[PDB]
Each structure stands twice: as C-alpha cells, then as structure tokens.
Amino acid sequence: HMTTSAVNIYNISAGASVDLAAPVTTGDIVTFFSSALNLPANTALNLLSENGAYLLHIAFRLQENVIVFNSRQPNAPWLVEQRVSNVANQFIGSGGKAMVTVFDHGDKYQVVINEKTVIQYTKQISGTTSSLSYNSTTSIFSTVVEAVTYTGLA
Amino acid sequence: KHMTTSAVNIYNISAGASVDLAAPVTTGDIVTFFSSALNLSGSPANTALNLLSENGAYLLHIAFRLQENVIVFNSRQPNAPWLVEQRVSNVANQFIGSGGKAMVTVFDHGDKYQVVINEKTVIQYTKQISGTTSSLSYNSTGTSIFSTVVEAVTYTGLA
Numbered sequence: 674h675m676t677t678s679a680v681n682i683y684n685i686s687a688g689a690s691v692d693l694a695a696p697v698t699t700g701d702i703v704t705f706f707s708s709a710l711n712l713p714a715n716t717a718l719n720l721l722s723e724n725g726a727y728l729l730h731i732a733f734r735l736q737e738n739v740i741v742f743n744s745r746q747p748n749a750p751w752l753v754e755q756r757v758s759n760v761a762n763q764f765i766g767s768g769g770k771a772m773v774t775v776f777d778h779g780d781k782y783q784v785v786i787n788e789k790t791v792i793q794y795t796k797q798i799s800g801t802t803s804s805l806s807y808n809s810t811t812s813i814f815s816t817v818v819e820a821v822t823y824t825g826l827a
Numbered sequence: 828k829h830m831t832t833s834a835v836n837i838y839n840i841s842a843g844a845s846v847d848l849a850a851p852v853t854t855g856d857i858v859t860f861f862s863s864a865l866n867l868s869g870s871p872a873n874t875a876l877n878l879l880s881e882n883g884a885y886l887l888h889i890a891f892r893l894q895e896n897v898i899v900f901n902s903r904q905p906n907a908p909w910l911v912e913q914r915v916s917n918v919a920n921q922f923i924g925s926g927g928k929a930m931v932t933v934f935d936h937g938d939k940y941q942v943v944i945n946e947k948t949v950i951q952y953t954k955q956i957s958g959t960t961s962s963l964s965y966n967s968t969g970t971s972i973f974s975t976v977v978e979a980v981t982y983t984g985l986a
C-alpha cells in the first residue's frame with residue numbers, strides 16, 4: 674500500500690538518446706542538467722514515446738532568439754509550435770550551468786528553466802515517455818547532459 | 828485555475844549552513860541534495876543533511892558516519908532528545924558506481940520519507956514527526972563527505 678518512487682540517472686551525449694528504465698507518465702518529472710551555458714547551433718531536448726513520437730520537443734534557437742515547443746507523430750509532420758521569445762532571458766542569473774525541468778501533468782507539460790516556468794504546454798500527443806534525446810550540431814549546453822527522472826510519484 | 832502548477836527551487840547550501848525554503852516541502856514533494864564531490868578516505872567527520880519544520884524540529888536527519896561506517900536516520904523535536912534511530916550499515920556500499928559526485932533524494936510520502944542515494948533506495952523511513960519541511964541544513968560537525976557547497980533542488984506543488 675505504500676508508495677515506492679524511483680530515481681534514475683542518465684548521461685546523454687549531444688546527438689544521443691537513452692531509453693528509460695522507468696517510463697515517465699502523469700505525475701512524474703524529468704530534469705536535464707547542463708554543466709555549461711553557451712549562450713551556437715540550434716539545440717533540442719526531447720521526450721519520446723515508445724513508437725518514436727516526439728511528445729515534447731524543446732528547441733533552443735539562439736540566432737532566431739526563440740525557444741520552440743512542439744510535438745510530432747512518428748514519420749509525420751511537426752504539429753503546432755508554441756514559442757517563447759528571448760533565449761538568454763530565460764536563463765537570467767544562470768551562470769555557467771542550467772537545468773531544464775519537465776513536469777508531466779497529464780494534459781500539459783510544465784517546463785521550468787532553473788526556477789522559472791517558461792511554458793504550460795498543452796499536449797498535442799498524449800502517452801508515456803519511454804526515451805529522451807539531446808540534439809545539436811556548438812550546443813548551448815554541455816557535451817553531456819545529465820537527465821534525472823523521478824517516477825512512481827502518482 | 829484548474830491546471831497543476833508545480834515549482835522548482837534551487838539552493839546552494841555550504842557546509843555548516845541552513846536555508847529557509849521559499850516553497851515548503853509537503854506530502855508528494857521531493858528534495859534532492861546534489862554533491863559535486865564524494866570523499867570516503869584528515870578523514871571526514873560525521874556529515875548530516877537535514878529537513879526541518881518551522882519550529883526547528885528535525886523531521887529527517889540523515890547522518891553519514893564514515894568512521895563508524897553507518898548512515899543514521901532520525902528525528903528530533905525542538906530542544907528535545909533524539910528519537911529512535913534507523914541505521915544502514917556500510918556507507919561506501921551505498922555509493923557504488925557514484926564516481927566523483929552523488930545525489931541524495933528524499934520523497935515525502937506522507938507517512939514515510941523514502942531516501943534514495945543515486946538510484947538506490949536505502950530506507951523507507953517511517954516518520955517519527957510529521958508536518959511540512961520549511962528549511963534544510965548541512966552539518967559537518969570539520970571535514971565533509973560531500974562538496975563544500977551542496978545544491979538542493981526542491982520539486983513542490985506536485986499533489
């Protein structure tokens with residue numbers, strides 16, 4: 674009858690993916706920790722489902738000066754973008770490191786950069802997150818990002 | 828309105844320092860202490876991480892005792908004797924594959940605190956004192972098992 678939660682720790686290199694040992698579902702959390710901020714080509718952090726849908730794609734675009742949030746079915750076009758302007762402003766007082774937290778709230782992903790909520794993203798695709806990935810060409814983050822998941826919360 | 832709003836707060840806690848939480852930790856919430864070092868050798872003095880209530884009760888005291896080779900979990904009311912210890916033997920074994928850093932996570936599950944070192948649950952601690960956590964502290968008696976600054980991250984507004 675007691676709640677047993679879990680912590681899993683992943684080291685994700687730029688241009689790499691990890692399968693989750695414990696999937697992320699409603700009530701759960703993933704935080705991506707970067708040991709650098711540069712602050713560089715477009716850089717993305719992704720939550721994917723088992724079938725390869727992008728449940729949440731977070732694209733940091735320094736030159737265009739926007740963070741793009743979107744979803745995509747496998748082998749299908751991108752869905753409707755949500756944008757937040759001014760990338761640097763989302764990392765105020767960040768120093769030489771950063772964290773990006775995604776709360777799975779069932780109907781929404783709440784994305785928090787350090788302590789600042791940057792979007793309450795209305796989901797365009799539902800389901801459990803079974804993998805994470807980190808894409809860059811010149812990343813805004815450290816070459817290895819540490820992802821920590823907190824699961825079995827609900 | 829109807830949507831869930833959770834919060835992330837980040838604290839830098841020096842050895843021998845405390846922080847008051849901007850958002851209290853309650854049932855359903857999480858705190859993780861991140862150390863950028865792990866010293867298991869001038870050998871470290873007993874080192875503790877603490878969750879305290881507003882009146883200064885130790886809701887959860889986690890004492891890493893390298894020389895005695897045990898981790899002690901306990902609680903204490905303000906100005907009162909320590910309550911019943913729970914112990915886990917062999918400190919180094921709890922940090923296997925840790926490398927040069929470590930994390931200590933506490934889940935507040937209402938009736939219990941679940942403590943996880945890296946990925947390993949080390950105790951399901953039945954609470955001896957209940958209530959919200961309003962501050963955290965880091966005590967090294969001397970030399971610490973962790974980095975001089977430990978970063979605490981709280982995840983709140985989960986329930």
Ligand SMILES: CC(=O)N[C@@H]1[C@@H](O)[C@H](O[C@@H]2O[C@H](CO)[C@H](O)[C@H](O[C@H]3O[C@H](CO)[C@H](O)[C@H](O)[C@H]3NC(C)=O)[C@H]2O[C@@H]2O[C@@H](C)[C@@H](O)[C@@H](O)[C@@H]2O)[C@@H](CO)O[C@H]1O
Pocket residue numbers: 715716717730732733741742743751752754808809
């Ligand atoms: C104003 C407007 O609507 N602009 C649209 C662009 O934003 C679109 O660009 C794509 O946006 C996607 C999210 O909606 C996504 O970020 C995508 O890049 C990512 O996915 C592609 C494959 O589709 C590649 O894997 C990229 O490497 C990957 N990026 C990262 C950082 O992981 C964007 O497309 C790329 O970037 C744009 C700027 C162009 O250079 C494209 O040629 C790239 O493929 C665009 C397409 O959906 O639609 C515009 O209307």
Ligand SMILES: CC(=O)N[C@@H]1[C@@H](O)[C@H](O[C@@H]2O[C@H](CO)[C@H](O)[C@H](O[C@H]3O[C@H](CO)[C@H](O)[C@H](O)[C@H]3NC(C)=O)[C@H]2O[C@@H]2O[C@@H](C)[C@@H](O)[C@@H](O)[C@@H]2O)[C@@H](CO)O[C@H]1O
Pocket residue numbers: 873874875888890899900901909910912966967968
């Ligand atoms: C086998 C057994 O039951 N042993 C008992 C000891 O473990 C008790 O020691 C105290 O244990 C506490 C948790 O139960 C706690 O760790 C405490 O140290 C902490 O609190 C004291 C104030 O009470 C000081 O502030 C310490 O600095 C602080 N330590 C840390 C790291 O935060 C323990 O007491 C200290 O350590 C022991 C080993 C002796 O040196 C004491 O004189 C110290 O005060 C003990 C007392 O509750 O009961 C034993 O039976």
